[PDB]
Design a protein around this nucleic acid. Sequence first.
RNA 1: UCCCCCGUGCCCAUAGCGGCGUGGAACCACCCGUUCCCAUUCCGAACACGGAAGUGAAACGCGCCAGCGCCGAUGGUACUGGGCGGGCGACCGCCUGGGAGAGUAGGUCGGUGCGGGGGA
RNA 2: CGAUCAACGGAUAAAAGUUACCCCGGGGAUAACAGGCUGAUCUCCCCCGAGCGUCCACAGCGGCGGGGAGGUUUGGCACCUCGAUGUCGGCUCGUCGCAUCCUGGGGCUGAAGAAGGUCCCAAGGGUUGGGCUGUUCGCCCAUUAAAGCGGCACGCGAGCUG
RNA 3: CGCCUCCUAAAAGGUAACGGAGGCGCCCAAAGGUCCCCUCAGGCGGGACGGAAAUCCGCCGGAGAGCGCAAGGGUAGAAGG
RNA 4: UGCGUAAUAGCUCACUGGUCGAGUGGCGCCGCGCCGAAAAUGAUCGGGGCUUAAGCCCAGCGCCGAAGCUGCGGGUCUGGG
RNA 5: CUGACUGGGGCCUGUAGAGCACUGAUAGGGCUAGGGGGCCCACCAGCCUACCAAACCCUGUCAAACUCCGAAGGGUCCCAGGUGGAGCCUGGGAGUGAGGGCGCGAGCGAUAACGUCCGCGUCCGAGCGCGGGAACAACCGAGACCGCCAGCUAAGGCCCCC
Lengths: 83, 141, 203, 59, 110
Amino acid sequence: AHKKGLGSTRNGRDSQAKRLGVKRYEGQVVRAGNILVRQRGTRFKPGKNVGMGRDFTLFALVDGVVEFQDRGRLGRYVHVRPL
Amino acid sequence: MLMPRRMKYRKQQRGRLKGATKGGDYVAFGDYGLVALEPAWITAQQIEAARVAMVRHFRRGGKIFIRIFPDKPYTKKPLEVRMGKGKGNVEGYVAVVKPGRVMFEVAGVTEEQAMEALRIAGHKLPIKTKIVRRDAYDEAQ
Amino acid sequence: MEYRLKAYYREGEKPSALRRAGKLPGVMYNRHLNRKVYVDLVEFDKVFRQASIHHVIVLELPDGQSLPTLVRQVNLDKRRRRPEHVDFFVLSDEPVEMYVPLRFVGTPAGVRAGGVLQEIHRDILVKVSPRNIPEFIEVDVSGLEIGDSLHASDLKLPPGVELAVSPEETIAAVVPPEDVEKLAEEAAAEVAEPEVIKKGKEE
Amino acid sequence: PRLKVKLVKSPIGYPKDQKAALKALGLRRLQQERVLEDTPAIRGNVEKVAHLVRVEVVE
Amino acid sequence: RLTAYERRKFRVRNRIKRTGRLRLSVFRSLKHIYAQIIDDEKGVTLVSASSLALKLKGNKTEVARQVGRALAEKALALGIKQVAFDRGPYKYHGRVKALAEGAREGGLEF
RNA sequence: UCCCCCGUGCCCAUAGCGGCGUGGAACCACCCGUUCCCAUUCCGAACACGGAAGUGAAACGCGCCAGCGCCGAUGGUACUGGGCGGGCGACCGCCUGGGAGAGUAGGUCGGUGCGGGGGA
RNA sequence: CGAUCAACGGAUAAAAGUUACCCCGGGGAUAACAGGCUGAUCUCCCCCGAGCGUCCACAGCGGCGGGGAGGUUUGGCACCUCGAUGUCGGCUCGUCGCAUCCUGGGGCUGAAGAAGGUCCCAAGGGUUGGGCUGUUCGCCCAUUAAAGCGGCACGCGAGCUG
RNA sequence: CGCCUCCUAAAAGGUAACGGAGGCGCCCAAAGGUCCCCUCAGGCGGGACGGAAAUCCGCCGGAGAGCGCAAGGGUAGAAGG
RNA sequence: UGCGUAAUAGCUCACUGGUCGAGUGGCGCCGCGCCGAAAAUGAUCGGGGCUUAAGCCCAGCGCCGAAGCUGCGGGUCUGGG
RNA sequence: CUGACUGGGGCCUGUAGAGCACUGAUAGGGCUAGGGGGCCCACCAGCCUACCAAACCCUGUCAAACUCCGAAGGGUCCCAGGUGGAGCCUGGGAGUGAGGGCGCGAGCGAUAACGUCCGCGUCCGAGCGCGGGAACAACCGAGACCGCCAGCUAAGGCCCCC
Ligand SMILES: NC(=[NH2+])NCCC[C@H](N)C(=O)O
Ligand SMILES: [Mg+2]
Ligand SMILES: [Mg+2]
Ligand SMILES: [Mg+2]
Ligand SMILES: [Mg+2]
Ligand SMILES: [Mg+2]
Ligand SMILES: [Mg+2]
Ligand SMILES: [Mg+2]
Ligand SMILES: [Mg+2]
Ligand SMILES: [Mg+2]
Ligand SMILES: [Mg+2]
Ligand SMILES: [Mg+2]
Ligand SMILES: [Mg+2]
Ligand SMILES: [Mg+2]
Ligand SMILES: [Mg+2]
Ligand SMILES: [Mg+2]
Ligand SMILES: [Mg+2]
Ligand SMILES: [Mg+2]
Ligand SMILES: [Mg+2]
Ligand SMILES: [Mg+2]
Ligand SMILES: [Mg+2]
Ligand SMILES: [Mg+2]
Ligand SMILES: [Mg+2]
Ligand SMILES: [Mg+2]
Ligand SMILES: [Mg+2]
Ligand SMILES: [Mg+2]
Ligand SMILES: [Mg+2]
Ligand SMILES: [Mg+2]
Ligand SMILES: [Mg+2]
Ligand SMILES: [Mg+2]
Ligand SMILES: [Mg+2]
Ligand SMILES: [Mg+2]
Ligand SMILES: [Mg+2]
Ligand SMILES: [Mg+2]
Ligand SMILES: [Mg+2]
Ligand SMILES: [Mg+2]
Ligand SMILES: [Mg+2]
Ligand SMILES: [Mg+2]
Ligand SMILES: [Mg+2]
Ligand SMILES: [Mg+2]
Ligand SMILES: [Mg+2]
Ligand SMILES: [Mg+2]
Ligand SMILES: [Mg+2]
Ligand SMILES: [Mg+2]
Ligand SMILES: [Mg+2]
Ligand SMILES: [Mg+2]
Ligand SMILES: [Mg+2]
Ligand SMILES: [Mg+2]
Ligand SMILES: [Mg+2]
Ligand SMILES: [Mg+2]
Ligand SMILES: [Mg+2]
Ligand SMILES: [Mg+2]
Ligand SMILES: [Mg+2]
Ligand SMILES: [Mg+2]
Ligand SMILES: [Mg+2]
Ligand SMILES: [Mg+2]
Ligand SMILES: [Mg+2]
Ligand SMILES: [Mg+2]
Ligand SMILES: [Mg+2]
Ligand SMILES: [Mg+2]
Ligand SMILES: [Mg+2]
Ligand SMILES: [Mg+2]
Ligand SMILES: [Mg+2]
Ligand SMILES: [Mg+2]
Ligand SMILES: [Mg+2]
Ligand SMILES: [Mg+2]
Ligand SMILES: [Mg+2]
Ligand SMILES: [Mg+2]
Ligand SMILES: [Mg+2]
Ligand SMILES: [Mg+2]
Ligand SMILES: [Mg+2]
Ligand SMILES: [Mg+2]
Ligand SMILES: [Mg+2]
Ligand SMILES: [Mg+2]
Ligand SMILES: [Mg+2]
Ligand SMILES: [Mg+2]
Ligand SMILES: [Mg+2]
Ligand SMILES: [Mg+2]
Ligand SMILES: [Mg+2]
Ligand SMILES: [Mg+2]
Ligand SMILES: [Mg+2]
Ligand SMILES: [Mg+2]
Ligand SMILES: [Mg+2]
Ligand SMILES: [Mg+2]
Ligand SMILES: [Mg+2]
Ligand SMILES: [Mg+2]
Ligand SMILES: [Mg+2]
Ligand SMILES: [Mg+2]
Ligand SMILES: [Mg+2]
Ligand SMILES: [Mg+2]
Ligand SMILES: [Mg+2]
Ligand SMILES: [Mg+2]
Ligand SMILES: [Mg+2]
Ligand SMILES: [Mg+2]
Ligand SMILES: [Mg+2]
Ligand SMILES: [Mg+2]
Ligand SMILES: [Mg+2]
Ligand SMILES: [Mg+2]
Ligand SMILES: [Mg+2]
Ligand SMILES: [Mg+2]
Ligand SMILES: [Mg+2]
Ligand SMILES: [Mg+2]
Ligand SMILES: [Mg+2]
Ligand SMILES: [Mg+2]
Ligand SMILES: [Mg+2]
Ligand SMILES: [Mg+2]
Ligand SMILES: [Mg+2]
Ligand SMILES: [Mg+2]
Ligand SMILES: [Mg+2]
Ligand SMILES: [Mg+2]
Ligand SMILES: [Mg+2]
Ligand SMILES: [Mg+2]
Ligand SMILES: [Mg+2]
Ligand SMILES: [Mg+2]
Ligand SMILES: [Mg+2]
Ligand SMILES: [Mg+2]
Ligand SMILES: [Mg+2]
Ligand SMILES: [Mg+2]
Ligand SMILES: [Mg+2]
Ligand SMILES: [Mg+2]
Ligand SMILES: [Mg+2]
Ligand SMILES: [Mg+2]
Ligand SMILES: [Mg+2]
Ligand SMILES: [Mg+2]
Ligand SMILES: [Mg+2]
Ligand SMILES: [Mg+2]
Ligand SMILES: [Mg+2]
Ligand SMILES: [Mg+2]
Ligand SMILES: [Mg+2]
Ligand SMILES: [Mg+2]
Ligand SMILES: [Mg+2]
Ligand SMILES: [Mg+2]
Ligand SMILES: [Mg+2]
Ligand SMILES: [Mg+2]
Ligand SMILES: [Mg+2]
Ligand SMILES: [Mg+2]
Ligand SMILES: [Mg+2]
Ligand SMILES: [Mg+2]
Ligand SMILES: [Mg+2]
Ligand SMILES: [Mg+2]
Ligand SMILES: [Mg+2]
Ligand SMILES: [Mg+2]
Ligand SMILES: [Mg+2]
Ligand SMILES: [Mg+2]
Ligand SMILES: [Mg+2]
Ligand SMILES: [Mg+2]
Ligand SMILES: [Mg+2]
Ligand SMILES: [Mg+2]
Ligand SMILES: [Mg+2]
Ligand SMILES: [Mg+2]
Ligand SMILES: [Mg+2]
Ligand SMILES: [Mg+2]
Ligand SMILES: [Mg+2]
Ligand SMILES: [Mg+2]
Ligand SMILES: [Mg+2]
Ligand SMILES: [Mg+2]
Ligand SMILES: [Mg+2]
Ligand SMILES: [Mg+2]
Ligand SMILES: [Mg+2]
Ligand SMILES: [Mg+2]
Ligand SMILES: [Mg+2]
Ligand SMILES: [Mg+2]
Ligand SMILES: [Mg+2]
Ligand SMILES: [Mg+2]
Ligand SMILES: [Mg+2]
Ligand SMILES: [Mg+2]
Ligand SMILES: [Mg+2]
Ligand SMILES: [Mg+2]
Ligand SMILES: [Mg+2]
Ligand SMILES: [Mg+2]
Ligand SMILES: [Mg+2]
Ligand SMILES: [Mg+2]
Ligand SMILES: [Mg+2]
Ligand SMILES: [Mg+2]
Ligand SMILES: [Mg+2]
Ligand SMILES: [Mg+2]
Ligand SMILES: [Mg+2]
Ligand SMILES: [Mg+2]
Ligand SMILES: [Mg+2]
Ligand SMILES: [Mg+2]
Ligand SMILES: [Mg+2]
Ligand SMILES: [Mg+2]
Ligand SMILES: [Mg+2]
Ligand SMILES: [Mg+2]
Ligand SMILES: [Mg+2]
Ligand SMILES: [Mg+2]
Ligand SMILES: [Mg+2]
Ligand SMILES: [Mg+2]
Ligand SMILES: [Mg+2]
Ligand SMILES: [Mg+2]
Ligand SMILES: [Mg+2]
Ligand SMILES: [Mg+2]
Ligand SMILES: [Mg+2]
Ligand SMILES: [Mg+2]
Ligand SMILES: [Mg+2]
Ligand SMILES: [Mg+2]
Ligand SMILES: [Mg+2]
Ligand SMILES: [Mg+2]
Ligand SMILES: [Mg+2]
Ligand SMILES: [Mg+2]
Ligand SMILES: [Mg+2]
Ligand SMILES: [Mg+2]
Ligand SMILES: [Mg+2]
Ligand SMILES: [Mg+2]
Ligand SMILES: [Mg+2]
Ligand SMILES: [Mg+2]
Ligand SMILES: [Mg+2]
Ligand SMILES: [Mg+2]
Ligand SMILES: [Mg+2]
Ligand SMILES: [Mg+2]
Ligand SMILES: [Mg+2]
Ligand SMILES: [Mg+2]
Ligand SMILES: [Mg+2]
Ligand SMILES: [Mg+2]
Ligand SMILES: [Mg+2]
Ligand SMILES: [Mg+2]
Ligand SMILES: [Mg+2]
């Protein structure tokens, strides 16, 4: 019977989710190498005993305890307090 | 009739209609107002019929303030098509209106003139309405 | 004039209980005091519709005290268009910012020509002594045509009262009226379709 | 003191975490009564299922 | 609006304090030169030396060098050895450089 | 331990903008030079060196002022975890716990650690 | 190092159509009929009263807009039925709804009379014969008080036609 | 039809529809490493040819510029020159 | 002010005089109802039938009511004796 | 003894709401480049505008792909309660990979569908066993080991059917 023609959608695309965010929260015991934050750019900055990778990934340089610090206009920092 | 001159996006999701009006709940300009008593998408056609009805009752004189604007695109699929194949086409524009919103205000006109013009205007809208007069409460806002 | 209003003290009563008993909840404050009050709604409404942040309201309290206040803020229930809470600002001896009613004297020549006087500001914000509060401020608008305007820089202020807004702020204007003769112009006025802001490689 | 907790309304149809709260209190049949110590951790589960339960202070 | 001076200083010193060493900060006025060895974890100065405090002679470059030796001698008697040089807003050159060379002659390790 | 200054941190504008005033003994700066080190896509402006006649004009430091900026309650409301009702619906209420944002009152022309020089 | 193995976890090194001559296994997991849910569309009824009607908003009309009802249209959905629920139109036989075509009773009229217009009540009965076309419908001829519209699986193929 | 960005996504992560919008299948021998130096867009005023916009000067101007290319995050106390 | 004439005239509203002798006219909000309300086999709130209810709103006391809970007896498994 | 769940403590978050500081939208007024038009002019300027109107300002608003703000909650770690047909490790055996209704949060649809597609929860599925809802998988009540001519209640009821 009378079925009308249709168009289509120029959309339908999206990329895979990237599983970003903080991975260890303040007060968690971590080992050297433990990734602490996954992020685009420096939403968090590396503090004491924390390195940063080429993709802004924050990881622990020593065994210890994660600590967060908000320094106002200077940004938010992730530290690792040695045990 | 009213619609945005430009926009960032052609089509908007539908959203909800919960709650009292966000702002625009007090008489801000004229002497009398027409307040929405229930929520709705008010169409640009409805606003223009409401405006013309007040202009025609005034003949010459007075001032109408339209305090809602239809910026929300209204979408409808072409007739006799099935579900799917993308979002419908924009057929018109609506203003979201929630209870307590002052949609129109009038000034420069007698009380009897305003009462009657706001009444005829209210008959063109898909919702119940109230006529109000500027108050000290309005002024203290 | 000088209005009076009985006020009462409240500690942990719930606002919805007070409002269900016909009482408007409120607060009293200045740099020295802050007290939770309530007034009677029908009593407050009788006074406020006249006094209205413009004129002084004296609060008679149950401890015998009486305090001269300005209504500083009225919170309205947006659904029902009803006051739900009042702020009473207890006046001291220093000056105070406040709104003094504007009073437009005379009929504009524009209004005679068919125009409409748009009272943009119906009061004006001002620093004045709480022993100096004028009833109003007259403004002659009889020389305004369509479309002239008046600003706060044209306010002839009484003595003791200093303007607390920018002198460039518009207070009144006389605008053209609604005209049915314009309708057919606006009806047969085609307005082109909305443009959508270019996104991506085309901008 | 202690809490006497009586299950008086069935958890059928209620979210599973409320069913777990009853298991943490040891309440498994209707009209069952348990006398539990009054600590903040036991009290948090009693309050969680307060709409199912009848409480009394005892001892 | 930061100045080129303040930007140069922040930039040089952030990089220094990243390495976690005690910093040898150097302030060079038109007349005098000054040095502090600073623990940035405690925000605390450990040993000082300057021309003004040693009431030192004429030629600013040799004065700077003697300031460095003086700082070294007092530093070692406290156990300090390794350090990071903080030229701050100045080029590594002349007076600052002399003070650094003078610190190294005295056994400060950097 | 108190006051001034010079370094250098911390809190992250209650610390800022603007206006006004103030300081050169000391310190700092401008300053005096461009031989020497070093330097300018040109320029001793900057960077750098050697100085010491002058000036606190610029900068900096220290006061005062609330026009701006920044901060900002109390009260009440929105919203809501959990618990219940109502409406054919769009949606609307009650209980208990939590509770903004805007705005009002008001606050602010910074506070503090360490070392160094000077002063009493 | 050689991949638009881009159908991008990439069947072969190497591949297109057609079937109304079709066949088997399955599915009401999925379409066409009919029902159902829905009611956009459809049909009908209202609200507002701009403006028409010489005069006069409302005899008769009703700009722009607003609210419903029905479930006869075209669809949406895919819920019973694909181990079968025969599908248009006609004939025959009815029966029901009423939003009434006629006949009966009314109000208003821009109702002199006669004849109309419009709305209200009313479903008892009645509602013709032909030309065309498969037609339903529609147009036309000749009449008529009138030549109503819909539902019943677009009523009725274990009743006929085809 | 694989991949990237945003939204839908209900403040962890994840989350569908033939839902709403865009991009990729490259590039760079510097557009890479390090050291040193430098700071934007924009507004106003001034300046031959010279203009809305070329280059010059002054004041204001915390980031609205820039970062090869979509979008987002990030960023001058540099990732920009 | 309404009704009328092409206009006219009119009767009249607003209006003021007298009689009468105490209330009258106009908004607005709340509870419960009225109309708006037409569809196809025979109707109906489940039926009968119900009106200071056997309806609706507020406040109570008692009872009825399941294979839920208790009492009594039994089985089986698990845990402890 | 590590579990679901719960107490306290820390950290992470950008939704509800709100807001307009950014990106856009936006009504009116003010101020004001640029145009339209009007006197005056070509000799290059000048005045006037109830015209359209950028920027800016005021008042008042809008936003999934806006955010100067921003909850309730949610997540995760630590310590504590929690002995449960809890949890963890290794290995044997599967079945399932057509879901469905309802509540709430959205998208799609038409602020349609016993519609459709996700999220949190629930029940049916497998509790078409039991009471209530006239009847009725998923609404209310409640998790049926067996027996009793015993008692108390739940939702719902207590004029008669009952
Ligand atoms: N935590 C709460 N009480 N939430 C209530 C949510 C709002 C609710 N629907 C009401 O209006 O009553
Ligand atoms: Mg069909
Ligand atoms: Mg179709
Ligand atoms: Mg396409
Ligand atoms: Mg898409
Ligand atoms: Mg793809
Ligand atoms: Mg993914
Ligand atoms: Mg996805
Ligand atoms: Mg993604
Ligand atoms: Mg995170
Ligand atoms: Mg690296
Ligand atoms: Mg890199
Ligand atoms: Mg901390
Ligand atoms: Mg630390
Ligand atoms: Mg939607
Ligand atoms: Mg609509
Ligand atoms: Mg739509
Ligand atoms: Mg679609
Ligand atoms: Mg659509
Ligand atoms: Mg429309
Ligand atoms: Mg609204
Ligand atoms: Mg209406
Ligand atoms: Mg406001
Ligand atoms: Mg009132
Ligand atoms: Mg591009
Ligand atoms: Mg229950
Ligand atoms: Mg149970
Ligand atoms: Mg239940
Ligand atoms: Mg729960
Ligand atoms: Mg939970
Ligand atoms: Mg039980
Ligand atoms: Mg109880
Ligand atoms: Mg200092
Ligand atoms: Mg410190
Ligand atoms: Mg000033
Ligand atoms: Mg100064
Ligand atoms: Mg001096
Ligand atoms: Mg001197
Ligand atoms: Mg030379
Ligand atoms: Mg020489
Ligand atoms: Mg020089
Ligand atoms: Mg120099
Ligand atoms: Mg000299
Ligand atoms: Mg000076
Ligand atoms: Mg001076
Ligand atoms: Mg300096
Ligand atoms: Mg002060
Ligand atoms: Mg803050
Ligand atoms: Mg605030
Ligand atoms: Mg509060
Ligand atoms: Mg809730
Ligand atoms: Mg609903
Ligand atoms: Mg609450
Ligand atoms: Mg509370
Ligand atoms: Mg909030
Ligand atoms: Mg606040
Ligand atoms: Mg300040
Ligand atoms: Mg300091
Ligand atoms: Mg000191
Ligand atoms: Mg000292
Ligand atoms: Mg492609
Ligand atoms: Mg494939
Ligand atoms: Mg292939
Ligand atoms: Mg690929
Ligand atoms: Mg894949
Ligand atoms: Mg292969
Ligand atoms: Mg192959
Ligand atoms: Mg081969
Ligand atoms: Mg092939
Ligand atoms: Mg073949
Ligand atoms: Mg053939
Ligand atoms: Mg064929
Ligand atoms: Mg053939
Ligand atoms: Mg054949
Ligand atoms: Mg054959
Ligand atoms: Mg053949
Ligand atoms: Mg064959
Ligand atoms: Mg077959
Ligand atoms: Mg087969
Ligand atoms: Mg078969
Ligand atoms: Mg399938
Ligand atoms: Mg089908
Ligand atoms: Mg079909
Ligand atoms: Mg079919
Ligand atoms: Mg059929
Ligand atoms: Mg069908
Ligand atoms: Mg059937
Ligand atoms: Mg239906
Ligand atoms: Mg309908
Ligand atoms: Mg319907
Ligand atoms: Mg329709
Ligand atoms: Mg109707
Ligand atoms: Mg009418
Ligand atoms: Mg006419
Ligand atoms: Mg007439
Ligand atoms: Mg007319
Ligand atoms: Mg009519
Ligand atoms: Mg119409
Ligand atoms: Mg409609
Ligand atoms: Mg309709
Ligand atoms: Mg039907
Ligand atoms: Mg049908
Ligand atoms: Mg129906
Ligand atoms: Mg269909
Ligand atoms: Mg159909
Ligand atoms: Mg279909
Ligand atoms: Mg089916
Ligand atoms: Mg389905
Ligand atoms: Mg079939
Ligand atoms: Mg068979
Ligand atoms: Mg069969
Ligand atoms: Mg058969
Ligand atoms: Mg029939
Ligand atoms: Mg009838
Ligand atoms: Mg008839
Ligand atoms: Mg008749
Ligand atoms: Mg006649
Ligand atoms: Mg007749
Ligand atoms: Mg008739
Ligand atoms: Mg009638
Ligand atoms: Mg009949
Ligand atoms: Mg009959
Ligand atoms: Mg008939
Ligand atoms: Mg015929
Ligand atoms: Mg024939
Ligand atoms: Mg013939
Ligand atoms: Mg025939
Ligand atoms: Mg025919
Ligand atoms: Mg035909
Ligand atoms: Mg024809
Ligand atoms: Mg005849
Ligand atoms: Mg007849
Ligand atoms: Mg039929
Ligand atoms: Mg049909
Ligand atoms: Mg059909
Ligand atoms: Mg049939
Ligand atoms: Mg038929
Ligand atoms: Mg048949
Ligand atoms: Mg047959
Ligand atoms: Mg047949
Ligand atoms: Mg048959
Ligand atoms: Mg048959
Ligand atoms: Mg038969
Ligand atoms: Mg045949
Ligand atoms: Mg034959
Ligand atoms: Mg997401
Ligand atoms: Mg998201
Ligand atoms: Mg998320
Ligand atoms: Mg994960
Ligand atoms: Mg597709
Ligand atoms: Mg593409
Ligand atoms: Mg290069
Ligand atoms: Mg510039
Ligand atoms: Mg210029
Ligand atoms: Mg020129
Ligand atoms: Mg230029
Ligand atoms: Mg940028
Ligand atoms: Mg009715
Ligand atoms: Mg009674
Ligand atoms: Mg029983
Ligand atoms: Mg049992
Ligand atoms: Mg026995
Ligand atoms: Mg037993
Ligand atoms: Mg047993
Ligand atoms: Mg067992
Ligand atoms: Mg344990
Ligand atoms: Mg654990
Ligand atoms: Mg917990
Ligand atoms: Mg929102
Ligand atoms: Mg904005
Ligand atoms: Mg604002
Ligand atoms: Mg919204
Ligand atoms: Mg919003
Ligand atoms: Mg969003
Ligand atoms: Mg948002
Ligand atoms: Mg603010
Ligand atoms: Mg804040
Ligand atoms: Mg939280
Ligand atoms: Mg979430
Ligand atoms: Mg938590
Ligand atoms: Mg969890
Ligand atoms: Mg926590
Ligand atoms: Mg434990
Ligand atoms: Mg189990
Ligand atoms: Mg298990
Ligand atoms: Mg086996
Ligand atoms: Mg399997
Ligand atoms: Mg399977
Ligand atoms: Mg499968
Ligand atoms: Mg599946
Ligand atoms: Mg399926
Ligand atoms: Mg599903
Ligand atoms: Mg499931
Ligand atoms: Mg069902
Ligand atoms: Mg649902
Ligand atoms: Mg509900
Ligand atoms: Mg939904
Ligand atoms: Mg969605
Ligand atoms: Mg609708
Ligand atoms: Mg479904
Ligand atoms: Mg649904
Ligand atoms: Mg839905
Ligand atoms: Mg489900
Ligand atoms: Mg199954
Ligand atoms: Mg069940
Ligand atoms: Mg189950
Ligand atoms: Mg069964
Ligand atoms: Mg049964
Ligand atoms: Mg049942
Ligand atoms: Mg039943
Ligand atoms: Mg029954
Ligand atoms: Mg059942
Ligand atoms: Mg059992
Ligand atoms: Mg009993
Ligand atoms: Mg009961
Ligand atoms: Mg009954
Ligand atoms: Mg009985």
